[PDB]
Design a protein around this ligand. Structure first.
Ligand SMILES: Nc1ncnc2c1ncn2[C@@H]1O[C@H](COP(=O)(O)OP(=O)(O)O)[C@@H](O)[C@H]1O
Ligand SMILES: [Mg+2]
Ligand SMILES: [Zn+2]
Length: 439
């Protein structure tokens, strides 16, 4: 019938869904279906970005080419589509010489039955694929060009791939077919690189998940100032778990830390000080690991202390150590409050921790340089950490600092962080921090 009916029908019949995850996923999908614009989709990992090109591909008359970096995830995408009985093929390196011969044979065929073709950037840019490609171009088969993991064009997206800089010329040969670019990487620098590198037609239809979540209360505490660090964390956990309601503990929480030793010790200290906490790290047997995870999920143990890692009622996330990046901190802290109820995100910052993490990052970079020489991209790793340091040391709204990093508008923070609740208090704490290293 109408556009909405076709979409709703395929959504249910093919993919098995009664609705879209979000109005944003819906709007993005409809903009791809309409086919009048180039489209940029920027949503977190797991938001269902794939549907935004997979579904309109099936509604189109031609084939959809999808460029994706790693064959592993490609195969998982293909396997998933195969379970949906979707006619999906993948051209990459893992294919044998005859397997390519058969896939090429279909694409060179009049009215091929390949609907969606996954391909790596190297294969899409290989001199061997150009004949098959030029045929598709000139015979006007192509409905969509999809560039997944579009951040790979960027020296600032933490996974730069040279072959992704070849996709722009490829797209320009196709003024006929709309281009859809998708990624979870949400910085303005990366977005600008994507638009230019893929030669996207302007104005681009942008569908981007807003970062600001008003039910999360962010604050930064300076370990240098805390007289009783374990007691401080204990009280933070108990408050968040609904201590003052006197109806028993409610919800759960996570404490992130860098080392297994801190993990084990924090779990001990918290348990001794009045909140049941269990350690979770790679040094444990996978047995004990699975047990602790379940005890947390099943709310037998309210607090998990973790070195690594989606429950809906996470009332707090505390970072005992500053994270390696702003993106990392945002994703980790953002595990709190998925049910929409009030939650607390606290970062325990210390300049000693800052120095140690900065040191470790630069040691990692140096290892990479010994391996494959200097790269333009190595500054990105440092800057991503520096943005989180600024977040900790700066006076201003915590939600705003996060928004700035992702290029979002000014958050309507209604006393939703420590700075906005009491700016003078935060300024006083920052002044005490400077005095701690004074004469
Ligand atoms: N409308 C929807 N309703 C429910 N689940 C969905 C919907 N769209 C996608 N999903 C599911 O969400 C999961 C994440 O999809 P994926 O495309 O891998 O996310 P992303 O690419 O954004 O990381 C997939 O398992 C997919 O089946
Ligand atoms: Mg994806
Ligand atoms: Zn604020």
């Amino acid at each position: 019938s109408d556009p909405e009916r076709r979409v709703r029908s395929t959504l249910k019949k093919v993919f098995g869904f009664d609705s879209f995850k979000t109005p944003l996923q819906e709007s993005a999908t409809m903009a791809v279906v309409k086919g009048n614009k180039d489209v940029f989709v920027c949503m977190p990992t797991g938001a269902g970005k794939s549907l935004c090109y997979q579904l309109p591909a099936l509604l189109a008359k031609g084939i959809t080419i999808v460029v994706s970096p790693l064959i592993a995830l490609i195969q998982d995408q293909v396997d998933h589509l195969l379970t949906l009985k979707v006619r999906v093929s993948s051209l990459n390196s893992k294919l044998s010489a005859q397997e390519r011969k058969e896939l090429l044979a279909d694409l060179e065929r009049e009215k091929p039955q390949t609907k969606i073709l996954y391909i790596t950037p190297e294969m899409a840019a290989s001199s061997s694929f150009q004949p098959t490609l030029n045929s598709l171009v000139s015979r006007h088969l192509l409905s969509y060009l999809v560039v997944d993991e579009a951040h790979c064009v960027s020296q600032w997206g933490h996974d730069f791939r040279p072959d992704y800089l070849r996709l722009g010329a490829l797209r320009s040969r196709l003024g006929h077919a709309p281009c859809v670019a998708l990624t979870a990487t949400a910085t303005p620098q990366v977005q600008e690189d994507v638009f230019a590198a893929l030669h996207l037609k302007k104005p681009v239809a942008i569908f981007k998940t807003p970062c600001f979540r008003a039910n999360l209360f962010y604050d930064v505490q300076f370990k240098e100032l805390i007289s009783d660090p374990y007691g401080n964390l204990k009280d933070f956990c108990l408050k968040a778990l609904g201590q003052e309601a006197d109806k028993g503990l409610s919800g759960c929480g996570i404490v992130y830390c860098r080392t297994r030793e801190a993990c084990e010790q924090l779990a001990i200290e918290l348990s001794c000080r009045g909140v049941n906490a269990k350690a979770y790290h790679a040094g444990l047997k996978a047995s004990e690991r699975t047990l602790v995870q379940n005890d947390w999920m099943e709310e037998k143990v309210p607090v998990i202390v973790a070195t690594i890692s989606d429950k809906a009622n996470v009332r707090f996330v505390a970072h005992w150590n500053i994270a390696k990046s702003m993106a990392g901190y945002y994703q980790e802290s953002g595990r709190a409050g998925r049910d929409g109820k009030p939650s607390w995100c606290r970062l325990y910052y210390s300049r000693n921790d800052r120095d140690q993490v900065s040191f470790l990052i630069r040691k990692e970079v140096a290892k990479l340089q010994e391996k494959r020489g200097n790269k333009a991209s190595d500054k990105a790793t440092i800057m991503a950490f520096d943005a989180l340091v600024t977040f900790c040391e700066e006076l201003g709204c915590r939600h705003a600092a996060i928004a700035k990093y992702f290029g979002d508008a000014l958050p309507a923070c209604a006393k939703g962080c420590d700075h906005c609740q009491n700016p003078t208090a935060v300024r006083r704490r920052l002044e005490a921090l400077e005095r701690s290293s004074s004469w």
